[PDB]
Amino acid sequence: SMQDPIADMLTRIRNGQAANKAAVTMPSSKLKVAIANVLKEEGFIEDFKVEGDTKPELELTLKYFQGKAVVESIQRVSRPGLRIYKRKDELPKVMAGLGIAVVSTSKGVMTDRAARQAGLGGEIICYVA
Amino acid sequence: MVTIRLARHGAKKRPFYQVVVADSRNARNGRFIERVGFFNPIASEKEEGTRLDLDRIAHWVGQGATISDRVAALIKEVNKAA
Amino acid sequence: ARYLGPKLKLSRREGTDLFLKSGVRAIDTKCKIEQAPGQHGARKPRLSDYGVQLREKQKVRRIYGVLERQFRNYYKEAARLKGNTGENLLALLEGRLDNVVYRMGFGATRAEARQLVSHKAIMVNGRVVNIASYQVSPNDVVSIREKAKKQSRVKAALELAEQREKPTWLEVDAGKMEGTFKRKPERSDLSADINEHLIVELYSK
């Protein structure tokens, strides 16, 4: 069975763009929407949908600025076999600021840049680059 | 017996004493409770040559410390403000 | 120590004038200084990547008259001194008193300035010194002992400085024969050709 469905979300995002697809659909949950809302704000994706009553299907619409995909590399970091928890002084600077690193802070799921403004630390979900 | 004596740091023939709160069993540079201030004999017109927390020394002399003679005479040179 | 051998031979390997015998002549105009490095002078070398990086560092040391042991400490000091390391390495070599006395014009050559500084003749801030490696602090004065005033060499070397670039990081008076170090030299303030990035990459390995 699947262990971390959140890492399945990034797999849909990576393979979806690699196959040059317009949208992808995955089973939904709270965190998958929360990271999508982060990706929606950051511009790495077009709008999502959580349409479905009993079986919520999360439907992300991919985004292609040109013939190459926007989300170049989307790496899972705090996987269940090795969970990382970095603090305020050591939040990574992905692509020296040219990419985000989604963190789950106590105040919420934020990007690293906004959490640094918030002055927090937390679980490093992914390295969207 | 707790006393306030001097260490002897620095090079050969150029010493830098350190007014230190140490038990009077340990050596000249050994274990100490708390380094409180310093001293520089070969100092002439630079910074001070002698700076030491007199507010801390009174805190020790009340508890039972012994001010060493070279220490008391240097405190005498820097009495409160003269 | 110090290199005490033939002086033009060092400038002959670099293929350029290292100002070691900088005076009233051009080069020597008669002994082949263009290309005759040693015996095998017609032998034109290719100089592989390391041999270029070594040769650039060898050029600077032959200019300022320093040795590897003391030179590497300048690199360590420049690498902790903030900013561009290569400029800081040039900031230190220009900071040497031995260079200052030369730039002031009291030296026919740094080798003359090395003897002049060492033989108790120069006073910085009214304090006589002998060390060639005295780092001259900004906004200071350099001067000469009056028994070293009128030695008939501080006159002759000072005239030749009129035929020099007249550096601006320091000024000089010639009345009482003293000058003042003013600011640090900039990278573009001098030298224009002595590469510095090749020196950094040599010690970078």
């Binding site: 950051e42 511009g43 790495f44 985004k63 600025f65 040109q66 926007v70 170049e72 692509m95 020296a96 600021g97 040219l98 990419g99 | - | 990547d49 900013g83 561009n84 390391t85 290569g86 510095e196 990035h197 950094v200 990459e201 970078s204 390995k205």
Partner: protein, 157 residues
């Protein structure tokens, strides 16, 4: 204006009827000092005749890759077939400290910076093709502003 640099030149053979024929291979890189780099491999049967066949293949296949002020943008992993090349921005670290064959492809690019360590198997033909792949895989602050976020002031600060 181009600053071509010869990197490596070796000798390959074929082994025909009566012996082996030593064709020489060259590997040069032309640059700009501005961001346009292209490697021409080439090979011939004579050494100076092989670099000329390398000079042409370079100039016709130069890749224009932008860069900030003489240094790379972000760290980048130029992997290609024998090498796991890594290049790091190195802000004003004043040294083109890099491995064999990686020094040449960067100091003609107009890089007076970047640290670089060539992991994997060092191989001149591959480590040149590694960084050429590595520079192409680097994005400008304006370029990432174009596809997401939409303000270079926003995404960078």
């Amino acid at each position: 204006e181009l600053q071509e640099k010869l990197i490596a030149v070796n000798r390959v053979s074929k082994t025909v009827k009566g012996g082996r024929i030593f064709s020489f291979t060259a590997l040069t890189v032309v640059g700009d000092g501005n961001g346009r780099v292209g490697f021409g491999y080439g090979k011939a049967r004579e050494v100076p005749a092989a670099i000329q066949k390398a000079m042409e293949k370079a100039r016709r296949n130069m890749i224009n890759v932008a860069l900030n002020n003489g240094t790379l943008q972000h760290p980048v992993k130029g992997v290609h077939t024998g090498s796991r090349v890594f290049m790091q921005p190195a802000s004003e670290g004043t040294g083109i400290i890099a491995g064999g064959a990686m020094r040449a492809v960067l100091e003609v690019a107009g890089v007076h910076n970047v640290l670089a360590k060539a992991y994997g198997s060092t191989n001149p033909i591959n480590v040149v093709r590694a960084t050429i792949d590595g520079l192409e895989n680097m994005n400008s602050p304006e370029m990432v502003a174009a596809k997401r976020g939409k303000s270079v002031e926003e995404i960078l600060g």
